Design a protein around this ligand. Structure first.
Ligand SMILES: [Zn+2]
Lengths: 205, 50, 121, 156
RNA sequence: AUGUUUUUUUUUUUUUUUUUUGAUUUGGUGAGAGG
RNA sequence: CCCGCAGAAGAAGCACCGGCUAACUCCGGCCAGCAGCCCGGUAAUACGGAGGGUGCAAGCGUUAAUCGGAAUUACUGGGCGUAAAGCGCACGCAGGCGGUUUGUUAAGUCAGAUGUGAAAUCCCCGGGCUCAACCUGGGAACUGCAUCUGAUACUGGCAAG
């Protein structure tokens, strides 16, 4: 139910930096980010039409840490919902509790955030929510509870975030350690490199 | 330095049409600013006027 | 084609017969080996392919391929067949590692497909 | 600015006194991400050369296509030889739902959102041609208005 | 008069320079000479 | 359901990597074996093992079975000179279709209403289980059938041309 292996390998495979490590130390120093994993890394022949789409899908999934069935479900939901499908999917992905936490800066990585969520550190509207897939709504305040507020990791995460660009769709307080999910993010607010359309196509086989 | 005298977000990217840190290495999306870079995306002489 | 014509006599659906009729819409069937033997395949191939004529539970007498390297089967050995045709007249495979048919010896990849338990170390 | 996609490359033979002389055909298609599309079919003893030739061919004899935003203006059929093709405009987000050679042509053309089936033959060369034809024939609202002696609001 | 009368794999890789609007890299201080 | 205790502790496999099809190398002789369709005779990315990878993941494969792809029974939506496909040719009952004008009818057709079309299910907006599945409020839908009141272009009936 989770990917427990090497994180940088995934990144290498993808091509890009997936942000699977905190960002204290640059990704180029930790691993050969350009070279693909395994014995046959240096060889890089152009991929197929299907293959590129698949890769794209993987990238997105990897980024958020969502396994396949769940991803499929999300896609379906997006399709069902009104408006642009890929965009909807992206929004849904964002909405995940762990992701939100990460954005806020209470977790160094998304993985860390997820872990925190699991371990009953986070509350959503003053009620302890344990599910990483929990879809956080507009105007839903989300905070660290008083037990987990003393942790050194949390402050480190916050610091890291502060170095990292702040998302417009949230509003977080470092002292209070509570952030308000103000609105579901627009496509423009998210990263431009993610070809959602490819993903959509893949499932529209 | 981010963000010191010679910043990225306040002024511009050292390299032309490149995020100094890492995204956009072609000519498609000139402008996007990710959180991992806190960088604009324009010309090499854009910092001379800013 | 003409609508009137269609009305008179509607369009016939192509009834596709099953290529594994001795199963009778069962995923596997139990059978007893009437005889076990080797057979030569058709052109362009060359081998001694291990196969057994099986009398099934439901009454049919079929011939079933035996996959993997080596087998313990004799006459009067109770085996499970699964369907699948080897590319004359063999339309079924013995399930290795079910009933009397043993798993393949010394096999470490695709183990499931030849009944083999996980190697301990 | 122009994007160019090699759809297929196929090895073709000519029998001679000695034996078989082999050659390679390259089917490419190029577009500017707007109305302009053009396919090219190039041939040579080696692949890369053939591809280059195809590209060259494509770059000349382009064709304009009226695009209402990211999609088509109305459902359009296009036929050529065996390949008969249907393509239907679709809502933003849906992506290019189309198969093979057909997809490639659409992508370069700068349609982002289509529902497109290729009936009949799916011989890449023919199907791309069919697609092109379909695109070409497809008229815009303004054009239709002009034709009919009306305003755009009269047609809706 | 007549020819299916010695076949066996002796096998194929999907986007930049857009017919002349673009890349080869060196800052202050002080001293001395020529006109 | 909540609180406390200890300590990374008790918790990852299955299939695949010739092309289709995401993933490649080395070591073992048309044998042993593989195979869904289209390898193996001594340098096999196709057999078996290894290392490396890819895809799924508390599941993963295989088999069986249904729809799909299959516009491959084509109502939507195919064809028939040579690819399968025009009766050897006619007459002709039933059947199908029917030039043009007016009038009338209102069967088909269309419009509106009424009754019904069980609940659940599906779909939309909500609510409740920490989320989800699940449960659940209200709607929409159930393409229909029947009846009543209209419309009369088209098709039909009847009457005259
Ligand atoms: Zn950037």
């Amino acid at each position: 139910a989770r990917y427990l292996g090497p994180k940088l390998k995934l990144s290498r495979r993808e091509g890009t930096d997936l942000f699977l490590k905190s960002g204290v130390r640059a990704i180029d120093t930790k691993c050969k980010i350009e070279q693909a994993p395994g014995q046959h890394g240096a060889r890089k022949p152009r991929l197929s039409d299907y293959g590129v789409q698949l890769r794209e899908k993987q990238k997105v999934r990897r980024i958020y840490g969502v396994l396949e069935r769940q991803f499929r479900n999300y896609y379906k939901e997006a399709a069902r919902l009104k408006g642009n499908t890929g965009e909807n999917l992206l929004a849904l992905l964002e909405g995940r509790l762990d992701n939100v936490v990460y954005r806020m800066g209470f977790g160094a990585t998304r993985a860390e955030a997820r872990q925190l969520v699991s371990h009953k550190a986070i509350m959503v509207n003053g009620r302890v929510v344990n599910i990483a897939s929990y879809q956080v709504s507009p105007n839903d305040v989300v905070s660290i509870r008083e037990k987990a507020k003393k942790q050194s990791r949390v402050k480190a995460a916050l610091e890291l975030a502060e170095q990292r660009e702040k998302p417009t769709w949230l509003e977080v307080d470092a002292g209070k350690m509570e952030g308000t999910f103000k609105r579901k993010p627009e496509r423009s607010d998210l990263s431009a490199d993610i070809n959602e359309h490819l993903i959509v196509e893949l499932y529209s086989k | 330095e981010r963000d010191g005298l010679f910043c990225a977000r306040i002024f511009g990217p050292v390299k032309d049409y490149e995020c100094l840190c890492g995204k956009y290495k072609r000519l498609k999306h000139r402008g996007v600013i990710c959180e991992k870079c806190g960088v604009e995306v324009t010309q090499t002489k854009v910092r001379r006027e800013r | 084609a003409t609508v009137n014509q269609l009305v008179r006599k509607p369009r016939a659906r192509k009834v596709a017969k099953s290529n594994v009729p001795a199963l009778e819409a069962c995923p596997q069937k139990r059978g007893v080996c009437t005889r076990v033997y080797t057979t030569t395949p058709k052109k362009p191939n060359s081998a001694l392919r291990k196969v057994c004529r099986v009398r099934l539970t439901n009454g049919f007498e079929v011939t079933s391929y035996i996959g993997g390297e080596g087998h313990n089967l004799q006459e009067h050995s109770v085996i499970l067949i699964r369907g699948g045709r080897v590319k004359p007249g063999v339309r079924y495979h013995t399930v290795r590692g079910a009933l009397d048919c043993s798993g393949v010896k010394d096999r470490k990849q695709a183990r499931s497909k030849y009944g083999v338990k996980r190697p301990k170390a | 600015e122009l994007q160019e996609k090699l759809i297929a490359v196929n090895r073709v033979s000519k029998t001679v006194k000695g034996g078989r002389i082999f050659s390679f055909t390259a089917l490419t298609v190029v577009g500017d991400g707007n109305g302009r599309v053009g396919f090219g079919y190039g041939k040579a003893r080696e692949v890369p050369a053939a591809i280059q030739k195809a590209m060259e061919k494509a770059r000349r004899n382009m064709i304009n296509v009226a695009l209402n935003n990211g999609t088509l203006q109305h459902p359009v059929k296009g036929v050529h030889t065996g390949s008969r093709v249907f393509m239907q405009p679709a809502s933003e987000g849906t992506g290019i739902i189309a198969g093979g050679a057909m997809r490639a042509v659409l992508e370069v053309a700068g349609v982002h959102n289509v529902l497109a089936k290729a009936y009949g033959s799916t011989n890449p060369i023919n199907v791309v041609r069919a697609t092109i034809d379909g695109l070409e024939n497809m008229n815009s609202p303004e054009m239709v208005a002009a034709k009919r002696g009306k305003s755009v609001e009269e047609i809706l």
